[PDB]
Structure 1
Amino acid sequence: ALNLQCIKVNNWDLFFSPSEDNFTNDLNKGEEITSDTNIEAAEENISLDLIQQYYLTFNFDNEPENISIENLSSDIIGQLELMPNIERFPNGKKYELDKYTMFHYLRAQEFEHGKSRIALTNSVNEALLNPSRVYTFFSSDYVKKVNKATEAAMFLGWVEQLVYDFTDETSEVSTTDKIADITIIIPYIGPALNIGNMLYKDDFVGALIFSGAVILLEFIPEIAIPVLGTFALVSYIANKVLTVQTIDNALSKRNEKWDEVYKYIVTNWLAKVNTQIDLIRKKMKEALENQAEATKAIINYQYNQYTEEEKNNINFNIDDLSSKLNESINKAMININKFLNQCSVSYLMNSMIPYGVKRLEDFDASLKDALLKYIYDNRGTLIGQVDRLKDKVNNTLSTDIPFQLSKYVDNQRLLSTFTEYIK
């Protein structure tokens, strides 16, 4: 690699990506159930309602008094809390890529809102080279019209059509049910951030339907669920009550186990996946704004080229133009956020949760044989009700416990995405 085209990417515009170390768990840890096994009650989620209950059981009156203390030395000697020393992060690190990145594509859509008023939209990343050429993922027809020198007599009409053209380009949306959990698809995202390195709405929609949401991720998160620890049971010969308590604890304990695995996966999904989708939706918003600015730049330049005819003949108001393009950006984002919400949840449900459920099913199978054997070996101690218990065990360990996102997440816009998903 002799020659290089390089761009400086601000540290804060880069991807998060937690270390696998931050995620620990003792799921593989075994356990022994006894008639005294402590059962963890259900941890009620935080909500305006819970906060309400806390507010009521709250004492506001009588604060501790300002009691008098004996004078200290006129100079109180103290030293602030240590505070760990963080090694300065390495800077300026260079990278040589075999592909244009999200950052290049995004950088390509920029220009200096300075004086240089001769910006020209175009469809190649060689707008990265020329500071007067801005890249656009919009159709080639759009570039032709926006770049075209326009007569003062046709300015307003020209603009009006660009506003509409702009909305048409950004309001673009595709539908399908060939992806599962993802019904809509915004095809221009592909050529906007070069997702998957293809830069063709066309290829994009295809890739997505083929392999799913994984296509968007900057890195495939890792998530494993070891073989779950199994339960050992203590029998209490001739002691029905204790024997029963053990069986109920083993059961209630299985529910906690499913909850534990579910919650763990949500923590991982939330930190490794959802974060990546969030940055992507932030970048889409950046791209859209870049486009609006470039177009406004070009349009305003045209207007300044006129001569006092701008007076009556035109009377242009760039603020109104900016306002309209902004509404289009918002409409666009509403779609994008919907699509990204689906991608995120889809990845959780199809590429992550499944791994835990299988581990949990293996576990249920084991616990079941165990408990039924237990009941049998103690049929003498439980004489009064083996069937009642057998039925209970069979009924409980035969059905997987439903994964309910609201049980772990509060973001209402993600919960509805889940509800919609359920159907």
Structure 2
Amino acid sequence: GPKYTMFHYLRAQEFEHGKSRIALTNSVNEALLNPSRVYTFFSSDYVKKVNKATEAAMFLGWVEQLVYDFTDETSEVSTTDKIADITIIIPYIGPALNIGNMLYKDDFVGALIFSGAVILLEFIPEIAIPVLGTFALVSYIANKVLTVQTIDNALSKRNEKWDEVYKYIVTNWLAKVNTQIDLIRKKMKEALENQAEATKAIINYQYNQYTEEEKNNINFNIDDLSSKLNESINKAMININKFLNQCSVSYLMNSMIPYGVKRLEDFDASLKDALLKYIYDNRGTLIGQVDRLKDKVNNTLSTDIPFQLSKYVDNQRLLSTFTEYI
């Protein structure tokens, strides 16, 4: 069961602008407990290479290593939506349990790998499809054209239904799911903007802690560093946006829509039963075309209506972007 919120994680990355030997750490707990400690999701190698005290000579080579590595920490990323979350249950009293019996979970939106750290995303709750309803099939004893008409209208309304549900799903995906993803977009840029300012204030300390002659005999410039980090960040944000787009579309296509389709297929099946029962109960009235109708019903209600994203998006620009990731 749940215990922390994101605040836990985010506070760990925060610091106030108050000068001290502030260092990057790989422990959320340690960051949260020492105000001169800041949590990084970068590799320990980068941590050891940033917390390090460095003589004024090798100082400008230190910085250059960092900026390459920083770029290499924020841009070298990987992704997948293939994740096995395995919980192993240790019997402390009994005999050992069979690995078959251990717990397995793979229902994840996707995962962003940073060499130093893995970011996983899951979404809840599953979308709620409004109840689809039951077509009232009106009988007209001894009236072929009119009973045929209720069959035909039943099948048309059914198609409309697939359209309504799809439309419903897309509008919520745009209005509720993508809006949340956008806030994640913003938080990830922010996390990065903040990791840049951590590494920055760690350096500015070292250089604003040197013999005033070295401070002039070392060409140094904040805007120089405070730019090679932003372009580094924007470069990194290209992959992150790509990932988040992939998550958005994957969620629409592999979670939301299939859930809606399952519903519409049930609807189809019980409408199919109703219509076949209807046909049998009017088979006198409908003589000459019972088999035609029986088949038109079966064929129709056994072929799914494919989902066409382009029906429901009138931005085109948005359409172009999302279509890539299918």
- Bucket of the pairwise TM-score, normalised by the shorter protein: 0.7 to 0.9
Q: Look up the SS of the partner of 2:100 in the other structure.
A: coil
**Aligned partner of residue 215 in structure 2, secondary structure:** helix
Contact 2:166 2:307 in 1 (8 A): yes
Three-state SS of the structure 2 residue aligned to 1:152 is coil
The yes-or-no answer on 1:329 pairing with 2:233 is yes
Cα shift at 1:131: 2.6
Q: Structure 1's 229 and 121: CA in aligned 2 closer, same or farther, altered over 3 A?
A: closer
C-alpha deviation, 1:233, in angstroms: 2.4
| Worse-matched range after superposition: 105-114 or 122-131 | 122-131
Displacement after TM superposition at 1:287 (Å): 1.3
CA 1:305–1:181: 2 relative to 1, 3 Å? closer
Residues 388, 194 of structure 1: alpha-carbon distance in 2 compared, 3 angstrom cutoff = closer
> What is the number of residues matched between the two proteins?
324
* CA distance, structure 1, for counterparts of residue 101 and residue 197 of structure 2: 25
Distance 1:107 1:181, change over 3 A: closer
RMSD of equivalent CA atoms: 8.1
What does the per-residue CA deviation read over 1:136-173, in whole Å, with 9 as the maximum and x for residues that have no partner? 11111112211222233222221111111101111232
Task: Call closer, same or farther: CA 1:337–1:192 in 2, change over 3 Å.
Answer: farther
Q: Deviations over 1:263-317 (max 9, x none)?
A: 3344555566444433333222221111100111112222222345457643222
Q: Is the 8 A contact 1:146 1:295 kept in 2?
A: yes
CA–CA separation in structure 2 for the residues paired with 1:187 and 1:320:
57
| 1:226 Cα offset (Å) | 7.0
2:31–2:37 contact (8 Å) kept in structure 1:
yes
Matched residue SS, 1:307: coil
SS at match of 1:316: coil
SS at match of 1:182: strand
Cα deviation, residue 133, structure 1 = 2.2
- Superposed CA offset, 1:178-211 (max 9, x none): 4699999999999999999999999999999999
What does the per-residue CA deviation read over 1:90-132, in whole Å, with 9 as the maximum and x for residues that have no partner?
xxxxxxxxx5542222112222235557565564532333332
Q: 1:220 to 1:250 in 2, by over 3 A?
A: same
Q: Could you tell me whether the CA contact under 8 Å between 1:277 and 1:344 is conserved in 2? A: yes
**Counterpart check, 1:250 vs 2:158:** no
164 and 183 in structure 1: CA distance in 2 versus 1, 3 angstrom threshold: farther
* Deviation sequence 1:309-343 (CA, Å, 0-9, x none): 45764322221222121122222222222223333
Deviations 1:38-82 (A, max 9, x none): xxxxxxxxxxxxxxxxxxxxxxxxxxxxxxxxxxxxxxxxxxxxx
Match of 2:84 among 176, 180, 187: 180
Higher RCO, 1 vs 2 (CA within 8 Å, ≥6 residues apart): 1
Distance 1:268 1:194, change over 3 A: farther
Q: Are the equivalent residues in 1 in contact too, given 2:43–2:115 (CA < 8 A)?
A: no
Task: Name the SS of the counterpart of 2:113 in structure 1.
Answer: helix
Identity rate, percent: 100
CA contact (8 A) 2:42 2:115 kept: no
Q: How far 1:224 sits from its partner (Å)?
A: 4.3
2:92, 2:112 → 1: CA distance? 13
Structure 2: gaps spanning 5 or more residues: none
Compared CA separation, residues 176 and 219, structure 1 to 2 (3 A): closer
CA contact (8 A) 1:379 1:386 kept: yes
1:116 maps to 2:20: yes
Relative to the length of structure 2, the TM-score reads 0.73
Paired residues of 1:118 and 1:132 also in contact (CA < 8 A): yes
